[PDB]
Every structure is written in structure tokens, then in C-alpha cells.
Swiss-Prot record, chain C:
Transmembrane portions of the chain: none
Included stretch of the parent chain: 131 to 195 of 486
Organism, scientific name: Saccharomyces cerevisiae (strain ATCC 204508 / S288c) (Baker's yeast)
Note in the entry: Present with 67700 molecules/cell in log phase SD medium.
Protein name from the UniProt record: Nucleolar GTP-binding protein 2
Subcellular compartments: Nucleus, Nucleolus
Protein family: Belongs to the TRAFAC class YlqF/YawG GTPase family. NOG2 subfamily.
Residue numbers of Phosphoserine PTMs: 25
From Swiss-Prot, chain D:
Further facts: Present with 18200 molecules/cell in log phase SD medium.
Family to which the UniProt record says this protein belongs: Belongs to the universal ribosomal protein uL10 family.
Job of this protein: Component of the ribosome assembly machinery. Nuclear paralog of the ribosomal protein P0, it binds pre-60S subunits at an early stage of assembly in the nucleolus, and is replaced by P0 in cytoplasmic pre-60S subunits and mature 80S ribosomes.
Consequence when changing residue 68 to D: Bypasses the requirement for phosphatase YVH1 for the release of MRT4
Quaternary context: Associates with the pre-60S ribosomal particle.
Compartments reported by the entry: Nucleus, Nucleolus; Cytoplasm
Keywords of the record: Cytoplasm, Nucleus, Ribosome biogenesis
Main location: nucleus
GO biological process, any: rRNA processing
Protein name (database record): Ribosome assembly factor MRT4
GO molecular function: large ribosomal subunit rRNA binding
Pfam families recorded: Ribosomal_L10, RL10P_insert
From Swiss-Prot, chain G:
Record localization: Nucleus, Nucleolus
Name assigned to this protein: Nucleolar GTP-binding protein 1
Domain of life assignment: Eukaryota
Domain OBG-type G span(s) in chain numbering: 18-190
Shown part of the complete sequence: 151 to 349 of 647
Family label: Belongs to the TRAFAC class OBG-HflX-like GTPase superfamily. OBG GTPase family. NOG subfamily.
Curated annotation (Swiss-Prot), chain I:
Name under which the protein is recorded: Large ribosomal subunit protein uL14A
Residues that bear N-acetylserine: 1
Primary role: Component of the ribosome, a large ribonucleoprotein complex responsible for the synthesis of proteins in the cell. The small ribosomal subunit (SSU) binds messenger RNAs (mRNAs) and translates the encoded message by selecting cognate aminoacyl-transfer RNA (tRNA) molecules. The large subunit (LSU) contains the ribosomal catalytic site termed the peptidyl transferase center (PTC), which catalyzes the formation of peptide bonds, thereby polymerizing the amino acids delivered by tRNAs into a polypeptide chain.
Source organism of the structure: Saccharomyces cerevisiae (strain ATCC 204508 / S288c) (Baker's yeast)
Gene name, Swiss-Prot/TrEMBL: RPL23A
InterPro entries the UniProt entry points to: Ribosomal_uL14 (IPR000218), Ribosomal_uL14_CS (IPR019972), Ribosomal_uL14_sf (IPR036853)
Major subcellular location class: cytoplasm
Length: 50, 68, 63, 234, 126, 65, 199, 191, 136
RNA sequence: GCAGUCAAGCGUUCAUAGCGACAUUGCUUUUUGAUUCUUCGAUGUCGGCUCUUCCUAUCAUACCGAAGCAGAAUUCGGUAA
RNA sequence: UUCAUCUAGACAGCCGGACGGUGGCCAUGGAAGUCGGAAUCCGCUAAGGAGUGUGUAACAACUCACCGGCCGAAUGAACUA
């Protein structure tokens, strides 16, 4: 908006942003696979993490 | 007319001169005077008129009697 | 620029940048520069007004 | 020591604890002064501002005033005859009665006693004493002096002082447009009041130095005459 | 009553054009000055201060090479308002102030004149 | 509101009447709450709490030294 | 983060709407032009910079919306040695199409002799080469132009030499005078805008 | 290590008579009577004197000796409440909407009724605990005084007002409104 | 309810599922509207979002003025062929189901509406009631 | 990740023989949001229709805490399936 | 366990002092120990930083570190299990 700029989102520090995004990955993605799974499932797991 | 009243439990005290009643062991049912206090659980008792040798004994082995 | 003045020196509670580092020589050159900037900006707004009426479609709220 | 204990709060300041050797130094300086100077007065300076003490200490140069722990001074002079330092000196360590200073000097006894009779400077009305006045904080915007210079002559009290005025001083204060303000006049103390801590902290806060200070001097030890004269100028 | 200020080198518009006289004996050296108002008119005065007098013995920086004949002088202007049994003490405050400023006294750093006095190598008229 | 309007508000009206004491009490309780967190935060939050406490203690030590 | 916190607080100055800046020294003692001619809170107590940023207020004149801007203040230094606080005032003057109101305090209170304020005006004259400018002499309820000195009045008549500049008396303690000053400033501003629009 | 015997001393003043049987303490004095049930603490009392009472724990741990000073201080607060009496003064402050705090009998009981808190149409009812007297000072505007023989009741009811007017979903740096304890004291002042 | 809707809306039988062509009642130049979405609809699994009288939809102009087609503008249903209940008990229906082009705040793009407009829609949308020559 | 650094500590007998937490530095596409609008061998067949339940690592809704959180909105976090 | 402090008064509390050159130098709208950059010394001392933090537009005030008064006898720190 052109006359005011109240609406910028909160920009966290670097380590805080690190914690935020990394923990969102560890929470909003599944976190259990086993080495006995098909390598396709292991791959899909880690590609999803990335 | 208006004094403080506090109900004091009159516990027998493990004190030098308290006489105990040995409830088990070779001195069963014999009196013995407490001679010194060793620690919280053990004391040195002596019961010479009843035939108790001077010894260090647990307090769970004897029963405090009202006599001092 | 970060070698000479840092972000902390540029702005903040510990800011040290108190004067503009490229202050103009005098007031009148500042004024004529400002007039040129305003003319350029307003001409830019005019020329971009030739591309839009999609902004006005936002007044009628379709996409 | 077993757990759940108060954590000692330390900070990063420059000055360090003095220790035993500073007391040894005070002890030895008192000893040498006793050997050197003649007259040794014991001065009671229980609550003394340092500029006052430094002016007193510089209103003469050829003498020396020594302070320190009362116990270390009584030790240096000696508790009793069995441990004293000069003949009949223990009658001085029996006369060290608080914040005590030792005034080793060669000035005539008359000069010193008249000076300590006639020296006075104003101080804050320190607590636990009879109040030397009565100031009522006026109603309205409280100013720095609380009315002791007029309102147009004084500046408003800092808004940041209001939490202290309201919590530590118990004065019912408001903030009206950034100015501390009481709706009704508030009296702090009356003449003759045995001051509490908060009364004397309020009086110091407004810079009310209506009271005065002078040195309470008890007996002095005359070195060569080896006796003590119980002067007492309270 | 008295009002003190340092920002020089209550009727504001009048005293400013009256205290210029007392200052500007100092070539733009910042000096504490006082005011002695009687009813509504003030009189200007320059207060003897260590830092301001050290500068006149010479952004900007101070290197000095001041000679010790004047440090004892500057100290001598401040004996009445200092806690010094000797002029050696007061010249030691002045040498401390000079070391704060950044100058050098008799062509070396002002602090060695402290232990110069302490070792007896330097002596002070008294 | 336009320019540092919260300092302006604190200057013109002060803070809440219990702000000093409620803040001081929270600070005093923080020593208890550190222990409570270190003994009750479980799992990943507990692991992070332990690691940040170790880092804060080593930074305090280095500050001292 | 610091920029976002600060930039979200900045006022909402519209360069294009009817604006009028309040230059010079309007904020003296209890009085302030921005607190009196519009609803807005501006700190006042006599030191050189009691506000470090632009403050905006608003009012309505002849059913139109106006904004009034209080500038943090300017010193009479050259441009190569002025700081950001007064670059704010200078940028506000130079950009916003406004009616500049330059205040002087003939009283003692601002901390400036009359000729200092006039020399400052002669310094910031070139910023005015495009706007409409007014001079406002305030605190006349505490000063006497009848006993105003001849050299003082000789400089004050000398500021009217600048084209488009006209002075007024005023006193913030009488609302009628401040409303008069605001009214004529607005009238000049509508005059210029209408001459533009009907062109 | 188990302390053989650790003791604390509860000093009874001249006008107070305390009765302690089976760790139920009754304290009676000029301002009324108080009773507290201490049966959850294994602690032993003793009347050493008409003006002193000894409270003691035999063979106690570090957690058990932590309860002697609590018991002693609780009995001490009883004594001070029954002689000096506790007086909590709360001041309610507001920016735009004036808080209206009245005392109303709802259903045979006594209630502080807070109204118009930040313009709320909700009426906030805080029950008055028994033995707590709610009084409105006239000398100072907008101040409540709570008094009673029990510090526990007075302080709890004061904190109940403090919390019933908690500001929700607003920036409490800007919204200063509420009922705040200003001063905790004694009714007398000075003896 | 929606943006610009006046007050609550009671239940009426849903007539217009997604994918339903409805006439353009106004004079904006569209000849029919194609409902692609319905405002306010709940998320039931296989249930198509359905629209009724007085409901705001999202519609594409499928036939008509080329200045209006290929665009997705909000619309407000003003008629309905599915019989619904009026509380003063009568089940009624119109002969066609139709709507009007509205900006999301409720204003009519057109300057008039032709044919009847249900009172449940005229009442709910003031700009519809203000542009409808025939109500009920 | 590799290669360094520092050193709380460790080894100990020699703290330089060596280990070594935390912290940090170099490498990764051009300092002015332009591009980098940009794709590069899954040897894999699982996936939808209906329908139930569980997990919490919570998206929403409930209640809280911390933020320049004025309001509105938002962000981060807590209890919570 | 090691080290340290302690009737030359220990730990915890109140109470008091917490000074003088001095508002040290530079900076600038202001910057007085406390936005900052470098000095960081002297005096007077029982002790008191060219200042540990809250604070002020700057000051003021409060604070600690440091002494001292009251009290009276043990206490603190780092480590190990």
C-alpha cells in the first residue's frame, strides 16, 4: 500500500528464523522411516524434507 | 483466665538415664539404662542389676519406659 | 558499503549515521533535483496509466 | 552445600574487595600516628556526607584523621590494659561508639574543642531524629522542590520518579499529561516528628536540608601526659 | 542565585549577547561559565577548570608539548577549590587531566611526571 | 499514532500501576521457572532447552573471563 | 526488523493532498500550532529538537480535507553539515506541494534572536521558489511590536521583499487568531491548486 | 543429615490467647478469632511460656524443616491479623470508561460489582470472602479498602478484584485500566 | 453473510449447483452466467456447492458482450426455478433462474434489472432492491 | 562436508605427545529484491471408490504467553486430538 | 574434594557514605559514568569505576562494586560421586 507501510510481516532474526523453519519441517512432515523400507519410500521421505 | 493452651505430647525421651526394655535378643524382658547416645538409631545401654552386659544396641531393639 | 558503515551504524538503537553521507552542496541544487524527481515520477505515473484498466477492474472486483 | 540455593549475583565492575591487608594498614597507620602525634580525639561521624568529611579533613593539614572499622581502631588502641598500646589508652577504645574517627594532632586542645564546638554544615534530616520542620507537598503538579522555591521558579518532577513516589514513598500520585500530580495537599512530617525511613527518604528526595550536622566529639588522649580528658560536646 | 553552563566557547535572548565578553578570551575552547543574576540581569564569569585551562596551554586533537612551568601554574589557579595538602597533589590532578586530554608535558607523556614527582625526580614550588 | 507513540504514552500516562512489581516478581520467579523447564520440558523442547542453557552458561563464563 | 518496526510507525503523509507545513518555531511554552489547529499531540518544551520526526495533523476547511505537518526544525548551517532530523524538514518543504508557514517568536523564549530566525529564513528561501509562503509572528500577547526596535522591524519588513511572502500577527492563546492564520493559509493553497486545475 | 531437633519461636503478645490441640490452632485476641488446620504438617508445638510458644520438628529432612518457618509465619500472620489487622488498599484507574465499583447484596451474600470496565456491558461479580470488609474511601477518589483478621482472605479477595479486571486482547502498554493493589498494610497503625 | 449483504439469510432450497447456467437479469450486457463457485458454502465431501435465491455466486459470462466474457465476476441470484418455501407458507418458483452481476461489495454493475426479483434477495441486498423494478 | 581457528574441559606423569564440547572462518552464480522468469537418467508401478479408527509432530475452532501488539490484522510460542 | 572468607565481625538483611579534579578528551541539536570512538589518570580516602544497571532531551534521582554502622557465627565457590 502506497501511503502507509504498517503491514510488513514480522521478520525474525537469523537463528530464530532457523528454528522456526527447521521446526516447522520437523513438525509438519512425517518423521519416522525405517532402513528396511523400500528405497523409494526413503527417498521420497528425504526429498520431502528438503 | 485467658492463657495459651497447647497440648504437648509427652514423648518418652532417649536420654542418659532413660531405662529401656530389651524386647528381643539374649536380654529379653530385662531393663537397661541408657548410658550414652550414639546416633539417631543406636545407643549404649546398660542393665547391670538385671544381667544385661554393657552394649551398643539399636533403638528398635528396646522399648523406652516411662522411668528415668 | 558494509565495510565502512554497518547495518547497526546505519539504523537502530546504536545508529551512528547522523548526517546524510552525500549531502548536496547547497539548497537550490537540492530543490531543482527534487523538482526533476517529481516531474519524472509523475510522468512515469501518467505513462503507466496508459497500461492499467486492470486497476479499475479491482474497483469492480472481478479477476 | 546441597542444592536449591540462592544464586550469588555477580557483575562486572572494576573495584575489588579490600580484604585483611587494608585493615592491617589502618591498624599500623593508627599505631604510627599514636607514636608521632600528641593529641588523639575520638570523633563520632555516624552519618557524614563525604564532602563534609573531606572539608573537615582539609580544614587542617598538619594533623591526621583516621577512620575504618570501629573494631579495628579499638584493637589498635587496645581493648584493655593487657593489650593496650600506651599508658591509660583503653579508656579510649571504651569510648568508640559507632562510626568513629581518630584525630591525631598537635594543635592545642582549646583550638580543637572550639572548632568542633563551632563547626556546622546543613545535612538531610536523616531518619530516626526529631524533624526540624514541616513540609506539606502542595496539591497539583509536584515540582522538584515541592514548593520550597515557587512554582514558576521550580521545574516539574520527572515523570519517571512517579513509581517511587507512589510505591516507595506511599504518596498518592497521579500522572496527568506526564506530570506527577496529587489531588490534595500531602504533609510529609511535622516539626518534632521522630522520622521514619520513608519520611526522611521523601525529605531527601525534595532536597530538604533543613537539618544541620556537627561533629560529636568525646574524650581525647593526651600522649605525653598519658591521660584522657572526657570532653563531651554533643 | 547562580546558573552554571558549559556550552560556550531566565531571559535567554539577553544573557547570550552579554556573556560573549567573558568568553572569547578562549579561542573556541569550551569552558564552564557561571551567571550571577541580581533581580533579572546576570553578570558573566569564567570558572577556573582543569580541562579548559589545560587546552589554553596549547574535528581536532591535542598533542601539546606543554612545559611544566605552566602545569604548576594551572594547578596554582585551582588550589582554593581542591583537596590537596601540597601543590604536588594539585599538579598531579592537573597531570591526570592533561593525560585525559591527550597532550604531552615537557615533551613526554604526562603520566611519567606522576612517578617523576613520586620518585623525587620532579619537584614543585610550594 | 505516528512516532514513538508508546514512549509518548509511557511519558504522558505512565505504565500500569503494578508494572514494576509484577515485572520484578516475574524476574524473581524466572530462577524457579528455569529449573521447572529443565526438569519438565520433554523431548525435543527439552533437548533444545538443555543446549541453549549450555550455550548461555558458556557465554556467561567467557564474558566473565 | 528495526526498519519494519520503525517504518510501520511513520505518518501517512500524502504528497498530493492539500498540505501546509509549519516551519520555524511554532512550539513555544504551552502553545503549539499543531496542537491548536488540529487534533494531534506534539511534544513541546524549549530545547532545540523536542521532536525528531515529522508530525501530521488534519483539519477540514470549506468541506475539504487538509493535512498540516510539523517539521522537527532547521538550523542555519550549510547543507553539507545538516543532520537527518532537519533533512526531514528540508525534504518535507522541498517535496510536498504546500503552503509553508514560517513562524518566528518575537519573544525571548525560543532561544534565537530575531535576526537569527530571519537569516535562517534567508537560508531556506530557495526551497520556497515554488510554494506559497507565509510568515507568522506569534506570542504577541507577551511582546510589544509598538516598542519593537527599528532595526528589528527593519529586518521584519525586509522579509516581505521575498515574493509571495506576507506576514501576520498571531497568538496561540486566542483561537480566533490561529483559525484566521490557518484560514488564510488554506485560502492561498486553494487559490494555487485551482489556478493549476482550471488551467 | 537429619537435624536432631529444629525449632522456631512464635511470640504471643500481651492480649492474645492461642489454643493448639492436635495441630489445630485457634488464635484469639482483641480483633476477633482465627483458626487454621495444620494437620498436613508433622510439627510439634509447646507452650514454653505464656508469651512464647516453641514449634519444633524432630528428625527432619531438608523438605520437612522447610515447613517449620512456614508454620511459624502462618501463626504469626494470624497474631498480627488478630491484633493489628490487615488492610489492603486497591486503587482502580481508567482512561476513558469510568469503572463503577459498588457493593451489592445479591442473594443474601455480599458482592463487589465492577461495571463499565473498558465499556463492557458485562457486570463482573466478585464475592466478598467472609470476614473481609470492603470499604470505599471518600478522601481519595477511586480507591477500595479491604480489611480483615486473615491476611489470606483479604489478599485473596483483593487479588480476585485485581484479576476480574484483566485486560484481554489489548496492548497492556497502552491500556492501563484495572483494579490494582496500591498498599498492603495494617489496620493499626500504630500498636 | 457475505460482503454487502444486509443481515442474516434463512434457508431456502438450493436450486443452482456449480455448473449451472443462469440468465443475466441486469442490463450489463451478459446474456447468461455460469456458476463456478458459491460463497459461504460448507465443506461436505461429495457435495457440489449449490446456490439459491439471494446467494452470491462466482460466475463467468459465457454468452454475450465480449467486453465481459473470459472474466470471473461475482453474481447475485435473483430468480429461481426450484420451488422454495416462504414462511407465510407458500412454496413458489419462478420460470427461470437468473442473476445479476455485482461487485463483491454488493453494488450492481448494471443500472436496472428486468423481470421479477424475489423478495428474499431484494431484502438481503439493498443495491438489488434499489435496481429492481419488479419485486416478488 | 572438507580444511582451519579458539579452548571450556580431557589426557595427565611433558598440558605440546596428543584428544577435545561450544563458538567461529573460508569455500557455494554479480552486494542496490535484476535475475538466479530455469526444467538435466527416481528401472517405481501404485491409486480411487466406499468406510472405520488411531497418532500429535495443531491447519482451524477454545484458552493462554511474548512482540512497536494504538485499534484492526499478523508473527512467534504454550496447553490442547 | 579443593580453595577461599570469618569476634581485625562471616553469609543475609536494613541504614549510611558512595567524594574531589570533572560536565576529562572527541563528537552534535543534546550526550554531565550510562547513543557512541578512544584515553582510562590523579587526588582524598574506611571506601567509592573517568562508572554496574534503571533513568533524563540533557542534567537530576535511584542503583552496584566498594566501604562503614546495627546483628552475631559460621559461610561462599568450583568440582566429584
Amino acid at each position: 500500500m502506497q501511503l502507509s507501510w504498517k503491514d510488513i510481516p514480522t521478520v525474525a532474526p537469523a537463528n530464530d528464523l532457523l528454528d522456526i523453519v527447521l521446526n516447522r519441517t520437523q513438525r509438519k512432515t512425517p518423521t519416522v522411516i525405517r532402513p528396511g523400507f523400500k528405497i523409494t519410500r526413503i527417498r521420497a521421505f528425504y526429498m520431502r524434507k528438503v | 483466665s485467658t492463657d495459651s493452651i497447647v497440648k504437648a505430647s509427652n514423648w518418652r525421651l532417649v536420654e542418659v538415664g532413660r531405662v529401656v526394655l530389651i524386647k528381643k535378643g539374649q536380654s529379653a524382658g530385662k531393663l537397661a539404662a541408657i548410658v550414652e547416645i550414639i546416633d539417631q538409631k543406636k545407643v549404649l545401654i546398660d542393665g547391670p542389676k538385671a544381667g544385661v552386659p554393657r552394649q551398643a544396641i539399636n533403638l528398635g531393639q528396646v522399648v523406652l519406659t516411662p522411668l528415668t | 558499503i558494509l565495510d565502512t558503515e554497518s547495518y547497526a551504524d546505519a539504523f537502530g538503537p546504536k545508529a551512528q549515521r547522523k548526517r546524510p553521507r552525500l549531502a548536496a552542496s547547497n539548497l537550490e541544487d537540492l530543490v531543482k533535483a527534487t523538482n526533476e524527481d517529481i516531474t519524472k515520477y509523475e510522468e512515469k505515473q501518467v505513462l503507466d496509466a496508459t497500461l492499467g484498466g486492470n486497476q479499475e477492474d479491482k474497483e469492480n472486483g472481478w479477476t | 552445600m546441597p542444592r536449591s540455593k540462592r544464586s550469588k549475583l555477580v557483575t562486572l565492575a572494576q573495584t575489588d574487595k579490600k580484604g585483611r591487608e587494608n585493615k592491617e594498614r589502618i591498624f599500623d597507620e593508627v599505631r604510627e600516628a599514636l607514636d608521632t602525634y600528641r593529641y588523639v580525639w575520638v570523633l563520632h561521624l555516624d552519618d557524614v556526607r563525604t564532602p563534609v568529611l573531606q572539608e573537615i579533613r582539609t580544614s587542617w593539614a598538619g594533623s591526621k584523621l583516621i577512620m575504618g572499622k570501629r573494631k579495628v581502631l579499638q584493637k589498635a588502641l587496645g581493648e584493655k590494659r593487657e593489650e593496650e598500646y600506651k599508658e591509660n589508652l583503653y579508656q579510649l577504645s571504651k569510648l568508640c561508639s559507632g562510626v568513629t574517627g581518630l584525630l591525631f594532632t598537635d594543635e592545642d586542645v582549646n583550638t580543637v574543642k572550639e572548632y568542633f564546638k563551632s563547626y556546622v554544615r546543613s545535612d538531610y534530616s536523616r531518619p530516626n531524629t526529631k524533624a526540624p520542620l514541616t513540609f506539606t507537598i502542595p496539591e497539583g503538579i509536584v515540582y522538584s522542590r515541592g514548593g520550597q522555591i515557587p512554582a514558576e521558579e521550580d521545574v516539574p518532577m520527572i515523570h519517571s520518579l512517579e513509581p517511587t513516589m507512589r510505591n516507595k514513598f506511599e504518596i498518592p500520585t497521579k500522572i496527568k499529561a506526564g506530570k506527577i500530580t496529587i489531588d490534595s495537599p500531602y504533609l510529609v512530617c511535622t516539626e518534632g516528628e521522630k522520622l521514619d525511613v520513608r519520611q526522611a527518604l521523601i525529605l531527601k528526595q525534595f532536597g530538604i536540608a533543613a537539618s544541620e550536622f556537627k561533629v560529636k566529639v568525646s574524650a581525647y588522649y593526651d600522649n605525653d601526659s598519658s591521660t584522657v580528658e572526657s570532653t563531651n560536646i554533643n | 542565585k547562580y546558573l552554571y553552563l558549559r556550552a560556550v566557547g531566565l531571559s535567554p535572548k539577553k544573557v547570550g549577547e552579554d556573556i560573549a565578553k567573558a568568553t572569547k578570551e578562549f579561542k573556541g575552547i569550551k569552558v564552564t561559565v557561571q551567571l550571577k543574576i541580581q533581580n533579572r540581569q546576570a553578570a558573566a564569569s569564567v570558572v577556573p577548570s582543569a580541562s579548559s585551562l589545560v587546552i589554553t596551554a596549547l574535528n581536532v586533537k591535542h598533542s601539546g608539548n606543554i612545559q611544566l612551568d605552566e602545569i604548576i601554574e594551572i594547578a596554582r589557579q585551582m588550589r582554593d577549590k581542591s583537596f590537596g595538602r601540597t601543590l604536588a597533589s594539585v599538579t598531579k590532578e592537573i597531570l591526570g587531566t592533561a593525560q585525559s586530554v591527550g597532550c604531552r608535558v615537557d615533551f613526554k607523556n604526562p603520566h611519567d611526571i606522576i612517578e617523576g614527582i613520586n620518585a623525587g625526580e620532579i619537584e614543585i614550588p610550594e | 499514532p505516528q512516532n514513538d507513540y508508546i514512549e509518548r504514552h509511557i511519558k504522558q500516562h505512565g505504565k500500569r500501576l503494578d508494572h514494576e512489581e509484577r515485572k520484578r516478581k516475574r524476574e524473581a520467579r524466572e530462577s524457579h521457572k528455569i529449573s521447572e523447564r529443565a526438569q519438565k520440558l520433554t523431548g525435543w523442547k527439552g533437548k533444545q532447552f538443555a543446549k541453549k542453557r549450555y550455550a548461555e552458561k558458556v557465554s556467561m563464563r567467557k564474558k566473565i573471563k | 526488523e528495526q526498519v519494519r518496526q520503525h517504518i510501520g510507525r511513520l505518518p501517512s503523509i500524502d504528497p498530493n493532498t492539500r498540505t501546509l507545513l509549519i516551519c520555524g518555531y511554532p512550539n513555544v511554552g504551552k502553545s503549539s500550532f499543531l496542537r491548536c489547529i488540529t487534533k494531534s499531540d506534539v511534544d513541546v518544551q524549549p530545547y532545540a529538537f523536542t521532536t525528531k520526526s515529522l508530525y501530521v495533523g488534519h483539519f477540514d476547511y470549506k468541506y475539504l480535507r487538509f493535512q498540516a505537518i510539523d517539521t522537527p526544525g532547521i538550523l542555519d548551517r550549510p547543507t553539507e553539515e545538516m543532520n537527518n532530523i532537519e533533512m526531514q524538514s528540508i525534504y518535507a518543504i522541498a517535496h510536498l506541494r504546500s503552503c509553508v508557514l514560517y513562524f518566528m517568536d518575537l519573544s525571548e523564549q525560543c532561544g534565537f534572536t530575531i535576526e537569527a530566525q530571519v537569516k535562517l529564513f534567508h537560508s531556506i528561501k530557495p526551497l520556497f521558489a515554488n510554494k506559497s509562503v507565509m510568515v507568522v509572528i506569534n506570542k504577541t500577547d507577551i511582546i510589544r511590536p509598538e516598542d519593537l526596535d527599528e532595526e528589528r522591524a527593519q529586518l521584519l519588513e525586509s522579509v516581505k521583499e521575498v515574493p509571495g511572502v506576507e506576514i501576520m500577527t498571531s497568538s496561540c492563546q486566542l483561537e480566533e487568531n490561529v483559525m484566521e492564520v490557518r484560514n488564510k493559509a488554506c485560502e492561498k493553497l486553494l487559490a494555487s491548486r485551482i489556478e493549476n486545475k482550471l488551467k | 543429615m537429619k537435624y536432631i531437633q529444629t525449632e522456631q519461636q512464635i511470640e504471643v503478645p500481651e492480649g492474645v490467647t492461642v489454643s493448639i490441640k492436635s495441630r489445630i490452632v485457634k488464635v484469639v485476641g482483641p480483633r476477633g478469632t482465627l483458626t487454621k488446620n495444620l494437620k498436613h504438617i508433622d510439627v510439634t508445638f509447646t507452650k514454653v511460656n505464656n508469651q512464647l510458644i516453641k514449634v519444633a520438628v524432630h528428625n527432619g529432612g531438608r523438605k520437612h524443616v522447610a515447613a517449620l518457618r512456614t508454620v511459624k509465619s502462618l501463626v504469626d500472620n494470624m497474631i498480627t491479623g488478630v491484633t493489628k489487622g490487615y488492610k489492603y488498599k486497591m486503587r482502580y484507574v481508567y482512561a476513558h470508561f469510568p469503572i463503577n465499583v459498588n457493593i451489592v447484596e445479591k442473594d443474601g451474600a455480599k458482592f463487589i460489582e465492577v461495571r463499565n470496565f473498558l465499556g463492557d456491558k458485562k457486570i463482573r461479580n466478585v464475592p466478598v470472602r467472609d470476614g473481609v470488609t470492603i470499604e470505599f474511601s471518600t478522601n481519595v477518589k477511586d480507591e477500595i479498602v479491604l480489611s480483615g483478621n486473615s491476611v489470606e482472605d483479604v489478599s485473596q479477595n483483593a487479588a480476585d478484584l485485581q484479576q476480574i479486571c484483566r485486560v484481554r486482547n489489548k496492548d497492556i502498554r497502552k491500556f492501563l485500566d484495572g483494579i490494582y493493589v496500591s498498599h498492603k498494610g495494617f489496620i493499626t497503625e500504630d500498636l | 453473510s457475505g460482503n454487502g449483504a444486509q443481515g442474516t439469510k434463512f434457508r431456502i432450497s438450493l436450486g443452482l449447483p456449480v455448473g449451472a447456467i443462469m440468465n443475466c437479469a441486469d442490463n450489463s450486457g451478459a446474456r447468461n452466467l455460469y456458476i463456478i463457485a458459491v460463497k459461504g458454502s460448507g465443506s461436505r465431501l461429495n457435495r457440489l456447492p449449490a446456490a439459491s435465491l439471494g446467494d452470491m455466486v462466482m460466475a463467468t459470462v459465457k454468452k454475450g458482450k465480449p467486453e465481459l466474457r473470459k472474466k470471473v465476476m461475482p453474481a447475485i441470484v435473483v430468480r429461481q426455478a426450484k420451488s422454495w418455501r416462504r414462511r407465510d407458507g407458500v412454496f413458489l418458483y419462478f420460470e427461470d433462474n437468473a442473476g445479476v452481476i455485482a461487485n463483491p461489495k454488493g453494488e450492481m454493475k448494471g443500472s436496472a434489472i428486468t423481470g421479477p426479483v424475489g423478495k428474499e434477495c431484494a431484502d438481503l441486498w439493498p443495491r438489488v432492491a434499489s435496481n429492481s423494478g419488479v419485486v416478488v
